[PDB]
Subunit: 116 residues, 4 copies
């Protein structure tokens, strides 16, 4: 394998952040954000199967994590969502895990990049 | 009412000369330029806007983290960091930068 | 030369009235009390020490995060947060608190 | 299963933090920190097998992550180590993952607590 994975934790509960919606976009030649993939985290706070090594070509990707819907569905948080934007696969294929740690007024995000 | 502070977690210092662009979501759902600056020597950016123009609405603060790391000779992961929020308490948007990670917090007083 | 700032990531605010204890590692490898205070209304603690007494050495800053969350009616994970470092650039120790997580950064200028 | 696990990431490299030494202590009846377990992270940045459900009784535990040796063994970091101190198993047995994200002048740590 899965070349793009998202893992989300809840810093308030000390648990996986479950049922967090995630939308992925890819910059198109026109320079606009085209829908690329979407899904939601599981009970372990992970999201797999967004894409395939074949479809995940080079490009600029935006991973939007819908944190406000997450918190509301539980609390009124600060951010609308957490947006992770990066160039991918520009030195050849890699695997990416986008990790995010969520608090109502704060989040962090880290990328773990490996080369299968 | 809107302040940006950026810290470098690799050097344990303010992140200086970082470009910051603020946008407001237009009725057409597009992002209109609203304000921009470079962080100061203390990693701070002030006077982006006034209480008058900073009306309720959704805002985006884009921090050009990539140019920052490149200036320092370091290869970073993100294109930029983006903070998106509804203005509806002075807002401080703080960001802590590492090459492959960043954290952002809102201090609303 | 030593400042502590504490933020609450749940409320997006300064963490007020948080007890902070600083210790210095003695030659006997024990931790000697060195300084302590409560964060202010701005989540800040200053005047812990002077340039004179803040000599090189290893220091520990203990932040009583547990009492903080309990005062707010919230069940937290950590007993406290601990920042341990060698003083050898003004040191700002900043901490960002959540019930089950905290981050700490050093800003050395 | 393993009731106490540690996971460490490097925020500079975007990778697991490998060969990070970790020492665990438990507060004794005397109120001093007794050695409880130690180990080092693997190539995936994880450390398993510190202890067993049977030995991991209630108590106050300190997980010390030796971040300075880690960075030096690569850079001169700020902290001596990252120290995670918590009461465990006071409402019955739980499983704990202590996650830490490391930068030379900053770290974060999060607990994920589950009830098998």
């Amino acid at each position: 394998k899965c070349p793009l994975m998202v893992k989300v934790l809840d810093a308030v509960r000390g648990s996986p952040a479950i049922n967090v919606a995630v939308h992925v976009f890819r910059k198109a030649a026109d320079d606009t954000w085209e829908p690329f993939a979407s899904g939601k985290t599981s009970e372990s706070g992970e999201l797999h199967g967004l894409t395939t090594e074949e479809e995940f070509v080079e490009g600029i990707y935006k991973v939007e994590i819908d944190t406000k819907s997450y918190w509301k569905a539980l609390i009124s948080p600060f951010h609308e969502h957490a947006e992770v934007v990066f160039t991918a696969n520009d030195s050849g294929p890699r695997h990416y895990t986008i990790a995010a740690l969520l608090s109502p007024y704060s989040y962090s995000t880290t990328a773990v990049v490996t080369n299968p």
